[PDB]
From a paper:
Leukotoxin ED (LukED) is one of these bicomponent pore-forming toxins that Staphylococcus aureus produces in order to suppress the ability of the host to contain the infection. The bicomponent pore-forming toxins have two separate water-soluble subunits, one of class S (related to the slow-eluted component of PVL) and one of class F (related to the fast-eluted component of PVL). The S subunit is typically involved in targeting the specific cell type via the interaction with surface receptors and in the recruitment of the other toxin subunits, leading to oligomerization and the formation of an octameric prepore. The prepore is composed of alternating S and F subunits and is able to assemble a β-barrel pore domain in the cell membrane, producing the mature pore that ultimately induces cell death by osmotic lysis.
Crystals of LukE12–311 and LukD27–327 provided measureable X-ray diffraction data to 3.2 and 1.7 Å resolution, respectively. Each of the two crystal structures had one molecule in the asymmetric unit, and the two refined models included amino acids 30–311 of a total of 311 for LukE and amino acids 27–325 of a total of 327 for LukD. Furthermore, LukD–HlgB superimposition results in an r.m.s.d. of 0.97 Å. The phosphocholine-binding pocket that is occupied in HlgB by a molecule of MPD in the pore structure or by a molecule of phosphocholine in the structure of the water-soluble monomer is occupied by a molecule of bis-tris buffer in LukD. Since it has been shown that the core of the cap and the rim domains are rigid between the monomer and protomer in each member of γHL and that they conserve their relative orientation upon octamer assembly, the structures of LukE and LukD have been superimposed on HlgA and HlgB of the γHL pore complex (LukE, r.m.s.d. of 1.67 Å on 232 Cα atoms; LukD, r.m.s.d. of 1.66 Å on 246 Cα atoms). The superimposition of LukE and LukD on the HlgAB complex reveals conservation of the residues that are important in the electrostatic interaction of the protomers in the complex. In interface 1 of the cap domain, Asp44 and Asp48 of HlgB and Lys15 and Arg16 on HlgA are involved in the interprotomer electrostatic interaction. These residues are conserved and correspond to Asp69 and Asp73 of LukD and Lys43 and Arg44 of LukE. In addition, Asp66 of LukE and Asp69 of LukD seem to also be very important in stabilizing the stems in the soluble form. Indeed, they are involved in intra­protomer hydrogen-bond interactions with Tyr141 and Tyr142 in the stems in LukE and in LukD, respectively, as well as with the main chain of the stems, indicating the importance of these residues in the transition of the soluble monomers to the pore-complex state.
Author numbering: 27 to 326
């Protein structure tokens, strides 16, 4: 159910006007949804258009509970890492100039408020504030849960692109750990989601139960990221923005070796990607969905 809202114009103050449009793009099979808020800013004091683009929506983990009847070997897939990127293309007058979060973050809840001030300055504050009808300045917020995970900014990031990774980082298993995607014990392997080393249960029932796993590992990730792009007002061409949501699905396994159990986590055994490409009209402050691309490296 693709949809783009009509442009809404709001005068922020005597110099600044906001033109807001939200675009939604989904892939029901992959359970990935992109909710993109395009906040176009026109500033009488400054010779560039600014776009504060908020990327929200949903990326399912792809987790499915293992079969409880799996006897001595079992496994499941889970959300090892979520990747989100925004890139500009088809117009050299457009550049990525700021973004949030700016820095590596392992807080359980990422909450920031990004503001615009005349002349193109961007400000950032921790926590959630503003964005009200009476607010005399423009702001937009990011708010997302990532307990046990860590946000990092992609290297690839430059003047045409910004990307983030939200990766399983410090996961506790009944007081033991923290474990990660590549933890190692010489006897027991990676105990990340192992139930018990000597359990008499079936393999399918010898994993850390679902509700004790991180929400991002077995449920969904609800991304909220901001990309700030500038566009020279001497340019009158449209441009394109490509937004990519991706999950790396890890395969966690257990096995009974006759003496004890062994766990292992296999990183990124299935990569699932959904990309939407929008045509941006900087004069009219409107967007149009060009296309979408969906991929799954190892479907099962």
């Amino acid at each position: 159910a693709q949809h783009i809202t009509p442009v809404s114009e709001k005068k922020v103050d005597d110099k600044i006007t906001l033109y807001k449009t939200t675009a939604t793009s989904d892939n029901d099979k992959l359970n990935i949804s992109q909710i993109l808020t395009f906040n176009f800013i026109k500033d009488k004091s400054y010779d560039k258009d600014t776009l504060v683009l908020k990327a929200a929506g949903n990326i399912n983990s792809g987790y499915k509970k293992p079969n409880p009847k799996d006897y001595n070997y079992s496994q499941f897939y889970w959300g090892g890492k979520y990747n989100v990127s925004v890139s500009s293309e088809s117009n050299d007058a457009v550049n990525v100039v700021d973004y949030a979060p700016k820095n590596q973050n392992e807080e359980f809840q990422v909450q920031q408020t990004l503001g615009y001030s005349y002349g193109g300055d961007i400000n950032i504050s921790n926590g959630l504030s503003g964005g009200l009808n009476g607010s005399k300045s423009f702001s937009e917020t990011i708010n997302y849960k990532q307990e046990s995970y860590r946000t990092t900014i992609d290297r690839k990031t430059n003047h045409k692109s910004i990307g983030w990774g939200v990766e399983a980082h410090k996961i506790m298993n009944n007081g033991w750990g923290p474990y990660g995607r590549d933890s190692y014990d010489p006897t027991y392997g990676n105990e990340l989601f192992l139930g018990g080393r000597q359990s008499s249960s079936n393999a399918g029932q010898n994993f850390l139960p679902t509700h004790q796993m991180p929400l991002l590992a077995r449920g969904n990730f609800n991304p909220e990221f901001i990309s700030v792009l500038s566009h020279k007002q001497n340019d009158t061409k449209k441009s394109k923005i490509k937004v990519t949501y991706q999950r790396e699905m890890d395969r966690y396994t257990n096995q009974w070796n006759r003496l004890h159990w062994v766990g292992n986590n296999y990183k990124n055994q299935n990569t699932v990607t959904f990309t939407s490409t929008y045509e941006v009209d900087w004069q009219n402050h409107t967007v149009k969905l060009i296309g979408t691309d969906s991929k799954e490296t190892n479907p099962g």
